[PDB]
Design a protein around this ligand. Structure first.
Ligand code: NGH
Ligand code: CA
Ligand code: CA
Ligand code: ZN
Ligand code: ZN
Length: 161
């Protein structure tokens, strides 16, 4: 069975933080992420502190030795969990690298929006434009960013209309 233990509404907890960018950037990257998944499907969510929610989004700094410790300039950036019991929504961002919103380094909004889908139930897809595509093509033109039909196909296989 695909959707998150069959639930159609879940709760997200920002407890990560960039120093390089203000909280307004880390907070608005998690919000912007969430609200864009709602722009393509009727699956709902909120963003709040409660005390460990359905989805936790927390900082990782040289501690991520559960799969791979501090890499810094290195392919693996941030993770999230989905077809799990307890890891049903749990995520990590690496403060070992430079998180950016203007294509210089680690694209904050894009990487955040991927962790949201990677927690809803979505694995890696195969369109270069897809938010679930596993390679950051480093495209500087943040005006052409859009969700692809293939990542849309997979979130539709979770909930749908
Ligand atoms: C489009 O947004 C992305 C977000 C995270 C990554 S990642 O490098 O952190 N990554 C791990 C992962 O699966 N995260 O959920 C894939 C990489 C190890 C191939 C890659 C792309
Ligand atoms: Ca890294
Ligand atoms: Ca969880
Ligand atoms: Zn982890
Ligand atoms: Zn992923």
């Amino acid at each position: 069975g695909i959707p998150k233990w069959r639930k159609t509404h879940l709760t997200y907890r920002i407890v990560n933080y960039t120093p390089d960018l203000p909280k307004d950037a880390v907070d608005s990257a998690v919000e912007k992420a969430l609200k864009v998944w709602e722009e393509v499907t009727p699956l709902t969510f909120s963003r709040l502190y409660e005390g460990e929610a359905d989805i936790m989004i927390s900082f990782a700094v040289r501690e991520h030795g559960d799969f791979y410790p501090f890499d810094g300039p290195g392919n693996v950036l941030a993770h999230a969990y989905a077809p799990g019991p307890g890891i049903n929504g749990d995520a990590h961002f690496d403060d070992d690298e430079q998180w950016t919103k203007d294509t210089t380094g680690t694209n904050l909004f894009l990487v955040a929006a991927h962790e949201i889908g990677h927690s809803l139930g979505l694995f890696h897809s195969a369109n270069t434009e897809a938010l679930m595509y596993p390679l950051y093509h480093s495209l500087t033109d943040l005006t052409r960013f859009r969700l692809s039909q293939d990542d849309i196909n997979g979130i539709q296989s979770l909930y749908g209309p």
